[PDB]
Amino acid sequence: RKQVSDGVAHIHASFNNTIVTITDRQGNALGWATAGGSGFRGSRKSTPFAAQVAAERCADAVKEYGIKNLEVMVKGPGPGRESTIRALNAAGFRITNITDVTPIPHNGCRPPKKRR
Amino acid sequence: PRRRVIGQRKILPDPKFGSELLAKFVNILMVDGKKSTAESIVYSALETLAQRSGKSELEAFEVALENVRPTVEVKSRRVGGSTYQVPVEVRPVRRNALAMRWIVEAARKRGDKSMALRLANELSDAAENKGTAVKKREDVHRMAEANKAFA
Amino acid sequence: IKVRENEPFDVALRRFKRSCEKAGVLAEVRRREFYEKPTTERKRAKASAVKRHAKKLARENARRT
RNA sequence: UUGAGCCUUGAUGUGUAGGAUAGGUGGGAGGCUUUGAAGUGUGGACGCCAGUCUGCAUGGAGCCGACCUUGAAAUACCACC
RNA sequence: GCUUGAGUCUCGUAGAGGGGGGUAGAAUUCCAGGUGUAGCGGUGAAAUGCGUAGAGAUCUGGAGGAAUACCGGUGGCGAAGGCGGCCCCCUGGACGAAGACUGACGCUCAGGUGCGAAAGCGUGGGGAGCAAACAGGAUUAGAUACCCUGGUAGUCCACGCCGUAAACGAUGUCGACUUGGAGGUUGUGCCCUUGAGGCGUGGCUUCCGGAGCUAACGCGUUAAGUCGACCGCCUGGGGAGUACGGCCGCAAGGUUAAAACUCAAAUGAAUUGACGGGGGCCCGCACAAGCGGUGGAGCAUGUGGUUUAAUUCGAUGCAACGCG
RNA sequence: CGCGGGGUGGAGCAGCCUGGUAGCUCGUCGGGCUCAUAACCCGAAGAUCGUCGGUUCAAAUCCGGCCCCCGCAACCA
RNA sequence: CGCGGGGUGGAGCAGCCUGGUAGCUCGUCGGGCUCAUAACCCGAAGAUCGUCGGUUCAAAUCCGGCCCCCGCAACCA
RNA sequence: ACUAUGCUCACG
Ligand SMILES: [K+]
Ligand SMILES: [Mg+2]
Ligand SMILES: [Mg+2]
Ligand SMILES: [Mg+2]
Ligand SMILES: [Mg+2]
Ligand SMILES: [Mg+2]
Ligand SMILES: [Mg+2]
Ligand SMILES: [Mg+2]
Ligand SMILES: [Mg+2]
Ligand SMILES: [Mg+2]
Ligand SMILES: [Mg+2]
Ligand SMILES: [Mg+2]
Ligand SMILES: [Mg+2]
Ligand SMILES: [Mg+2]
Ligand SMILES: [Mg+2]
Ligand SMILES: [Mg+2]
Ligand SMILES: [Mg+2]
Ligand SMILES: [Mg+2]
Ligand SMILES: [Mg+2]
Ligand SMILES: [Mg+2]
Ligand SMILES: [Mg+2]
Ligand SMILES: [Mg+2]
Ligand SMILES: [Mg+2]
Ligand SMILES: [Mg+2]
Ligand SMILES: [Mg+2]
Ligand SMILES: [Mg+2]
Ligand SMILES: [Mg+2]
Ligand SMILES: [Mg+2]
Ligand SMILES: [Mg+2]
Ligand SMILES: [Mg+2]
Ligand SMILES: [Mg+2]
Ligand SMILES: [Mg+2]
Ligand SMILES: [Mg+2]
Ligand SMILES: [Mg+2]
Ligand SMILES: [Mg+2]
Ligand SMILES: [Mg+2]
Ligand SMILES: [Mg+2]
Ligand SMILES: [Mg+2]
Ligand SMILES: [Mg+2]
Ligand SMILES: [Mg+2]
Ligand SMILES: [Mg+2]
Ligand SMILES: [Mg+2]
Ligand SMILES: [Mg+2]
Ligand SMILES: [Mg+2]
Ligand SMILES: [Mg+2]
Ligand SMILES: [Mg+2]
Ligand SMILES: [Mg+2]
Ligand SMILES: [Mg+2]
Ligand SMILES: [Mg+2]
Ligand SMILES: [Mg+2]
Ligand SMILES: [Mg+2]
Ligand SMILES: [Mg+2]
Ligand SMILES: [Mg+2]
Ligand SMILES: [Mg+2]
Ligand SMILES: [Mg+2]
Ligand SMILES: [Mg+2]
Ligand SMILES: [Mg+2]
Ligand SMILES: [Mg+2]
Ligand SMILES: [Mg+2]
Ligand SMILES: [Mg+2]
Ligand SMILES: [Mg+2]
Ligand SMILES: [Mg+2]
Ligand SMILES: [Mg+2]
Ligand SMILES: [Mg+2]
Ligand SMILES: [Mg+2]
Ligand SMILES: [Mg+2]
Ligand SMILES: [Mg+2]
Ligand SMILES: [Mg+2]
Ligand SMILES: [Mg+2]
Ligand SMILES: [Mg+2]
Ligand SMILES: [Mg+2]
Ligand SMILES: [Mg+2]
Ligand SMILES: [Mg+2]
Ligand SMILES: [Mg+2]
Ligand SMILES: [Mg+2]
Ligand SMILES: [Mg+2]
Ligand SMILES: [Mg+2]
Ligand SMILES: [Mg+2]
Ligand SMILES: [Mg+2]
Ligand SMILES: [Mg+2]
Ligand SMILES: [Mg+2]
Ligand SMILES: [Mg+2]
Ligand SMILES: [Mg+2]
Ligand SMILES: [Mg+2]
Ligand SMILES: [Mg+2]
Ligand SMILES: [Mg+2]
Ligand SMILES: [Mg+2]
Ligand SMILES: [Mg+2]
Ligand SMILES: [Mg+2]
Ligand SMILES: [Mg+2]
Ligand SMILES: [Mg+2]
Ligand SMILES: [Mg+2]
Ligand SMILES: [Mg+2]
Ligand SMILES: [Mg+2]
Ligand SMILES: [Mg+2]
Ligand SMILES: [Mg+2]
Ligand SMILES: [Mg+2]
Ligand SMILES: [Mg+2]
Ligand SMILES: [Mg+2]
Ligand SMILES: [Mg+2]
Ligand SMILES: [Mg+2]
Ligand SMILES: [Mg+2]
Ligand SMILES: [Mg+2]
Ligand SMILES: [Mg+2]
Ligand SMILES: [Mg+2]
Ligand SMILES: [Mg+2]
Ligand SMILES: [Mg+2]
Ligand SMILES: [Mg+2]
Ligand SMILES: [Mg+2]
């Protein structure tokens, strides 16, 4: 069933969460995990290890598809990502290349007001 | 101490089992400075332990103390502002001393008859890990494993 | 940004990101920088720069260290 | 692209006893094998990962049913589900 | 008359100066479409909110609006307000080079008149994001706030109004004059461009400092120095930039502008402390790491209280209470 | 005068129209915390239910009178 | 009038068509935490299937009642 | 994270 060779591990690392989502070559979702879906709630959800375990939980649950090697597509800042990529090696993949899709607006939309 | 890094006092070996590990166990078991009463209880306990387990005393006490020994314990540190649970690798000197205290603390409760009987039973239950001392390590692990997020 | 690192290596090493953007998108266009505040916070970051640079010429004091 | 029935055919179905990833029940003791065999090289189907199932062939014509463990006997042949 | 001030032409240089029209890319929201399976979102921590009607994430194709990453600087231009993607259209000024011309044409300006951020206001468009008001969830003794999720006027445009801001170098305009250093920026000379240079001299500009000035802080050839011209303004603090009238505005309100009454101060700069939920560095059973206690009981003692004829008197956060 | 509904610790509310059970939130008293007060934490007390009578084995709760209390009605000429 | 589904700790849930092993989330007490409070995390205290009956190796589970719980849409003395 | 207050006058 399908049995894709390669894929793309999208990582949406915000300050509060780290949503890992392994897709195929043509941006088509195969599975996902989150820091909130791993357990780790509140203060624990915003950490490098809670992203690591989320990537370990996203590493499995895509074994049916059988991805050998993939590309990382980190996004946002977050405490994860400099930790989440370590998890993809230790799990069982080969990282072809690492990239950023951090959406830089070229002074476009007025952001929200500063908080106090 | 704020910036006064000084070493610790030397201890003495116990006459009948010339060593160090159980010599400190006597000190933790002691109350009101009565070492004569406390040392008689530890010998009575380890002699009743060695009869049942079918081993020596040092090795019977070891295969018991290691089963109630903590690997990682949980402190809490406020670095920035908030208060969360940071686990840390316990030091080898405190490692075995923290275990000895949990054996004695469990033996205060669980009122069988004698202190020599209670320690013997606690150390016997520690050998087949099913006492209250192993439960107190087991919970200490669960905090470190659950709150492993924090470095 | 697009970093492959040949084949035998892996170990991240993507200072290409960290020495280019990240801070530009994040701690600037995350929440609103009220037009004047940049003009204020820059001119004090600019005045603090020449304060150090002018002192660095006069830093050669007696010392005795 | 459908939403089911439905027949042919082929497996599938590990409380525990235990050589068995055996559901209930049964025609009743030779099937089959040179209508080119046991063991296996390798890979597929299945998998509660205990161990089933099988394409083709180097090989070469054997393998085996009651017996002993069960509340039950062997998909050796074969009837009905 | 003269030509040094002032102005004209001549050739260039730099610039988010202006006004009008285009067009680009990133992103946000949304729209339908594919994938896909439980969360997403948020927070100090939660909840409201959003999701099994299939959200979030991911990709495909649109639509629309607003704003222009990096270059980008103690950079530039503008009288000030202010002015940043790129391209044409019309257009104002600035500065430099060496001449030629005019021949005091100048400087200030009460009234007058123009321009004048943001917020407002009016009529007609547009409306992604953001967001007064407003709603809900938190917070709290309360929370008409701060935080969170939603969210309308508004922010955008065209055209009129408004005429104010800490519209600030809290420093009116013009001119002359008086030690320095390091730079930034844009010119134009002399020299070998002999190789990213050698050496001057004009604009504008930022920083530090001399004399001098200043209450001091500081200012200091871009003066708060030394002088001249003219203008505006000030005369203790409150009352009050308020009332009343006038003018101006659709209004909001602006502008002009008192008095009674009341106080003996209000104020500026700097000095020594003390304090800070300011910063740095240290310390002590301060905390951590332990261990045994008090607080629960009974009794002893000492206070408070209450009672009494008297319950002598003193000690009362720490540093009074088995204290005198 | 008619008609429903009420009257419960100091306050405001449940429990009341299905008979044996008295809660909640503040406040009060006691102890902590603080230099002290507030806030905060931990204990404690406090109502025989408008009143007088019934019915009943037993009434805050059922029924009747009487005393305050709200809401509704007192209309056509 | 019916044919149908539905029935568990205090309660809201599933699990109940594919007989041998009753989950899961709020009420539950002790911890660890911290000068402390909130949180957050760890483990404990409770139903042999509302209940009674047939068969068969094993029955919440297969089949019949009850107490019921209804979904409804029918219901013309 | 948030976290209030201190009744009057008195140092020639
Ligand atoms: K304006
Ligand atoms: Mg010391
Ligand atoms: Mg500005
Ligand atoms: Mg001339
Ligand atoms: Mg001129
Ligand atoms: Mg040129
Ligand atoms: Mg220009
Ligand atoms: Mg131009
Ligand atoms: Mg222009
Ligand atoms: Mg323009
Ligand atoms: Mg325009
Ligand atoms: Mg675009
Ligand atoms: Mg777009
Ligand atoms: Mg459609
Ligand atoms: Mg759709
Ligand atoms: Mg919730
Ligand atoms: Mg909800
Ligand atoms: Mg849902
Ligand atoms: Mg819905
Ligand atoms: Mg769907
Ligand atoms: Mg979607
Ligand atoms: Mg989406
Ligand atoms: Mg798109
Ligand atoms: Mg478009
Ligand atoms: Mg200029
Ligand atoms: Mg000017
Ligand atoms: Mg034009
Ligand atoms: Mg000009
Ligand atoms: Mg001109
Ligand atoms: Mg000239
Ligand atoms: Mg003349
Ligand atoms: Mg002449
Ligand atoms: Mg004037
Ligand atoms: Mg005037
Ligand atoms: Mg005007
Ligand atoms: Mg204007
Ligand atoms: Mg105008
Ligand atoms: Mg405006
Ligand atoms: Mg308008
Ligand atoms: Mg109107
Ligand atoms: Mg209209
Ligand atoms: Mg809108
Ligand atoms: Mg918003
Ligand atoms: Mg808001
Ligand atoms: Mg409001
Ligand atoms: Mg709501
Ligand atoms: Mg609110
Ligand atoms: Mg509230
Ligand atoms: Mg929003
Ligand atoms: Mg615009
Ligand atoms: Mg326009
Ligand atoms: Mg226009
Ligand atoms: Mg006007
Ligand atoms: Mg004016
Ligand atoms: Mg003014
Ligand atoms: Mg200004
Ligand atoms: Mg300014
Ligand atoms: Mg200056
Ligand atoms: Mg002024
Ligand atoms: Mg003028
Ligand atoms: Mg000039
Ligand atoms: Mg000086
Ligand atoms: Mg002077
Ligand atoms: Mg001076
Ligand atoms: Mg000056
Ligand atoms: Mg000069
Ligand atoms: Mg000069
Ligand atoms: Mg000059
Ligand atoms: Mg001058
Ligand atoms: Mg001057
Ligand atoms: Mg002066
Ligand atoms: Mg005056
Ligand atoms: Mg006055
Ligand atoms: Mg006066
Ligand atoms: Mg006025
Ligand atoms: Mg008028
Ligand atoms: Mg008018
Ligand atoms: Mg108005
Ligand atoms: Mg005036
Ligand atoms: Mg007075
Ligand atoms: Mg003043
Ligand atoms: Mg002062
Ligand atoms: Mg301080
Ligand atoms: Mg300090
Ligand atoms: Mg000491
Ligand atoms: Mg301590
Ligand atoms: Mg202790
Ligand atoms: Mg204690
Ligand atoms: Mg006390
Ligand atoms: Mg006591
Ligand atoms: Mg007491
Ligand atoms: Mg005595
Ligand atoms: Mg007394
Ligand atoms: Mg008396
Ligand atoms: Mg006394
Ligand atoms: Mg006294
Ligand atoms: Mg006294
Ligand atoms: Mg004293
Ligand atoms: Mg009560
Ligand atoms: Mg009290
Ligand atoms: Mg009363
Ligand atoms: Mg009676
Ligand atoms: Mg009663
Ligand atoms: Mg049905
Ligand atoms: Mg302490
Ligand atoms: Mg009828
Ligand atoms: Mg007060
Ligand atoms: Mg005071
Ligand atoms: Mg005072």
Side-chain angles (χ1 to χ4, degrees), chain A residues 4-12 19-28 30-31 55 58 62 67-75 81 84-86 88-89 92-101, chain C residues 1-6 10 14:
Chain A
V4 306
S5 186
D6 64 323
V8 182
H10 284 92
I11 301 165
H12 181 85
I19 302 167
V20 190
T21 300
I22 297 167
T23 76
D24 78 348
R25 165 65 62 184
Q26 302 299 140
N28 216 59
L30 312 172
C58 195
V62 294
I67 301 156
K68 299 180 180 180
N69 45 13
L70 51 80
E71 295 92 291
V72 178
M73 288 269 170
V74 291
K75 196 171 180 181
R81 107 191 172 184
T84 316
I85 298 158
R86 260 80 175 181
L88 296 165
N89 299 339
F93 288 94
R94 291 165 81 275
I95 305 303
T96 315
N97 50 283
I98 318 175
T99 53
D100 311 330
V101 293
Chain C
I1 294 170
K2 292 185 169 176
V3 169
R4 305 170 75 175
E5 302 292 348
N6 306 354
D10 207 307
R14 55 205 312 270

Side-chain angles (χ1 to χ4, degrees), chain B residues 1-142:
Chain B
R2 209 130 209 169
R3 198 169 55 82
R4 315 299 168 192
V5 180
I6 305 168
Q8 297 187 328
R9 285 170 250 87
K10 297 180 179 179
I11 344 183
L12 298 167
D14 285 20
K16 290 171 180 170
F17 297 110
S19 177
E20 190 271 304
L21 190 66
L22 75 82
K24 196 125 177 217
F25 188 69
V26 167
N27 286 323
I28 305 188
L29 187 63
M30 193 168 72
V31 70
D32 309 332
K34 296 185 174 184
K35 206 157 178 172
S36 321
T37 59
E39 192 164 24
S40 301
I41 293 157
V42 174
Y43 297 157
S44 183
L46 270 50
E47 284 168 24
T48 54
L49 185 65
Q51 189 183 329
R52 298 162 66 181
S53 62
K55 313 262 281 171
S56 191
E57 282 78 4
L58 295 167
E59 86 187 312
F61 189 77
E62 182 65 281
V63 181
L65 190 65
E66 72 192 75
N67 293 306
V68 298
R69 194 170 295 177
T71 313
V72 288
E73 89 184 89
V74 184
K75 210 180 174 189
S76 326
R77 218 170 202 266
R78 325 186 185 187
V79 171
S82 302
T83 53
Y84 304 124
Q85 291 267 65
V86 183
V88 59
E89 276 73 283
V90 71
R91 306 306 303 176
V93 176
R94 196 192 165 182
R95 197 175 230 175
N96 80 313
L98 187 53
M100 282 187 280
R101 198 203 293 152
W102 295 343
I103 295 160
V104 171
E105 184 60 37
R108 305 307 202 210
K109 266 68 174 177
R110 196 152 163 278
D112 294 274
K113 292 295 170 77
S114 184
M115 189 73 258
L117 190 67
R118 283 178 274 192
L119 293 164
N121 295 8
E122 281 286 0
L123 294 164
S124 292
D125 290 20
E128 305 186 328
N129 44 40
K130 62 175 186 174
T132 314
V134 300
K135 195 75 188 294
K136 192 151 171 55
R137 111 191 190 82
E138 189 170 304
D139 290 313
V140 164
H141 280 231
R142 296 270 168 75

Side-chain angles (χ1 to χ4, degrees), chain A residues 105-110:
Chain A
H106 293 346
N107 282 20
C109 283
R110 189 204 257 263

Side-chain angles (χ1 to χ4, degrees), chain C residues 1-27:
Chain C
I1 294 170
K2 292 185 169 176
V3 169
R4 305 170 75 175
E5 302 292 348
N6 306 354
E7 328 84 332
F9 174 80
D10 207 307
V11 59
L13 183 35
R14 55 205 312 270
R15 55 162 76 259
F16 295 107
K17 177 178 200 163
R18 201 175 296 178
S19 69
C20 192
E21 299 177 320
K22 180 186 183 174
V25 66
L26 186 272

